[PDB]
DNA sequence: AAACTATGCATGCTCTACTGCTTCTGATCTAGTCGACT
């Protein structure tokens, strides 16, 4: 019953887009804090009955900070490979 | 004078081979990524 299974990726993408659009640091910090607080409240609500929980903010934190990813090996797809795959798949 | 048989022709179906054109597949080759070394 991980929290990440109830959080659409669209919400995280929208939060990141709002953070990027904002100019002042205050707005970015406010958006991130609101998202984290919502996640924490949902986590508390979900795990009321469970005693030992391994669920955390890792699923979103790893995506927010890809430069700190070490569990996942190199994807092997750089910009050129990604462009080639997009061209082939989209049938452009 | 009548019946049987040798001879031949015309045509459809089938195996077998050969020549040539087109397409598919195995083999011969450069770009991208990770890694080794110095």
Swiss-Prot record:
Tissue expression as described in the entry: Testis, thymus, prostate and heart.
Name of the protein described by the UniProt record: DNA ligase 4
Associated disease: LIG4 syndrome: Characterized by immunodeficiency and developmental and growth delay. Patients display unusual facial features, microcephaly, growth and/or developmental delay, pancytopenia, and various skin abnormalities.
Entry's localization field: Nucleus
Assembly mode: Interacts with XRCC4; the LIG4-XRCC4 subcomplex has a 1:2 stoichiometry and XRCC4 is required for LIG4 stability. Component of the core long-range non-homologous end joining (NHEJ) complex (also named DNA-PK complex) composed of PRKDC, LIG4, XRCC4, XRCC6/Ku70, XRCC5/Ku86 and NHEJ1/XLF. Additional component of the NHEJ complex includes PAXX. Following autophosphorylation, PRKDC dissociates from DNA, leading to formation of the short-range NHEJ complex, composed of LIG4, XRCC4, XRCC6/Ku70, XRCC5/Ku86 and NHEJ1/XLF. Interacts with DCLRE1C; the interaction is direct. Interacts with APLF.
Function as written in the Swiss-Prot or TrEMBL entry: DNA ligase involved in DNA non-homologous end joining (NHEJ); required for double-strand break (DSB) repair and V(D)J recombination. Catalyzes the NHEJ ligation step of the broken DNA during DSB repair by resealing the DNA breaks after the gap filling is completed. Joins single-strand breaks in a double-stranded polydeoxynucleotide in an ATP-dependent reaction. LIG4 is mechanistically flexible: it can ligate nicks as well as compatible DNA overhangs alone, while in the presence of XRCC4, it can ligate ends with 2-nucleotides (nt) microhomology and 1-nt gaps.
Similarity section: Belongs to the ATP-dependent DNA ligase family.
Residues of the full protein shown: 8 to 99 of 911
């Amino acid at each position: 019953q991980t929290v990440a299974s109830h959080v659409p990726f669209a919400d995280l993408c929208s939060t990141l887009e709002r953070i990027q659009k904002s100019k002042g640091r205050a707005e970015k910090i406010r958006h991130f804090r609101e998202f984290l607080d919502s996640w924490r409240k949902f986590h508390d609500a979900l795990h009321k009955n469970h005693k030992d929980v391994t669920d955390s903010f890792y699923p979103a934190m790893r995506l927010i900070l890809p430069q700190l990813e070490r569990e996942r090996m190199a994807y092997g797809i750089k910009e050129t490979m990604l462009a080639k795959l997009y061209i082939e798949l989209l049938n452009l």
